[PDB]
Amino acid sequence: CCGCRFPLLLALLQLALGVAVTVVGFLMASVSSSLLVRATPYWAGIIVCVVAYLGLFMLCVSYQVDERTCIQFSMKLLYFVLSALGLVVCVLAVAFAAHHYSLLTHLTCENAPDSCQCKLPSSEPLSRTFVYRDVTDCTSITGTFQVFLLVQMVLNLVCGLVCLVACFVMWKHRY
């Protein structure tokens, strides 16, 4: 069935992408402790992995002889809904990661006792600073942190593209 193994391969590809996203998010959370949940989309990775889980369950039910066709098209509508939800969540993650990288491109940071103090240049002598605790050297913020952000945004855009083309094929077979 040409139209049947395509959801399976898309589901496993999205599983791999979500696993990579969650790993990158946990690495970012391990970079420093003072950061917030809004900063890293590891929650988004968890959500899209739950999306992959429910998609796998629906595909397993559908591959076996379904009890009801009513359940079948209800589950297909749910599959379309979750593909759209994964798309919107990945888009939000892309936007947040891009904004955070754009922010981190324009901070000057210095090493504080077991921490970092990153302040921004201002015309007035006063300025707003931020404290990143449990950070020995600020290079970890200027090094692996921005690499992690780039990998996270690449994975998020790839996953969003996957969800969008999944919706594309769904309505190319549905409308």
Side-chain angles (χ1 to χ4, degrees):
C1 184
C2 291
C4 302
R5 82 292 183 276
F6 208 70
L8 207 58
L9 61 94
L10 289 188
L12 57 92
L13 201 52
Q14 186 251 308
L15 280 164
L17 294 172
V19 160
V21 164
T22 46
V23 162
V24 169
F26 278 137
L27 277 165
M28 294 202 283
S30 75
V31 161
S32 187
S33 69
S34 284
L35 284 149
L36 287 165
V37 182
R38 302 283 191 189
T40 187
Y42 82 107
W43 181 30
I46 290 166
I47 292 167
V48 65
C49 285
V50 176
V51 175
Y53 194 71
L54 188 153
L56 274 177
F57 209 98
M58 171 211 72
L59 281 182
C60 180
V61 169
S62 293
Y63 283 150
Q64 192 268 329
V65 180
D66 56 357
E67 176 56 50
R68 301 174 190 170
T69 80
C70 173
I71 296 298
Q72 210 283 327
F73 65 95
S74 297
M75 271 169 155
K76 280 318 282 201
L77 183 63
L78 189 49
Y79 183 51
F80 194 59
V81 162
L82 56 89
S83 296
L85 282 181
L87 172 52
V88 65
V89 162
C90 287
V91 166
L92 273 166
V94 160
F96 281 142
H99 187 280
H100 192 54
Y101 177 75
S102 61
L103 286 180
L104 293 187
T105 45
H106 316 313
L107 276 296
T108 306
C109 205
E110 64 91 23
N111 289 314
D114 62 270
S115 54
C116 277
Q117 297 173 12
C118 307
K119 67 181 69 65
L120 61 83
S122 300
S123 65
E124 72 281 358
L126 311 174
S127 281
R128 186 185 65 172
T129 195
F130 318 101
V131 173
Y132 289 163
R133 298 165 197 86
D134 307 310
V135 176
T136 54
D137 194 1
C138 301
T139 59
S140 174
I141 317 296
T142 75
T144 184
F145 198 33
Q146 59 96 20
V147 170
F148 279 159
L149 287 182
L150 287 169
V151 173
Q152 173 70 269
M153 68 98 76
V154 161
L155 289 168
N156 283 325
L157 62 83
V158 164
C159 201
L161 282 152
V162 161
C163 298
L164 164 79
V165 300
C167 300
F168 174 86
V169 178
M170 277 198 84
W171 67 254
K172 184 159 266 294
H173 284 148
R174 201 251 181 186
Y175 282 168

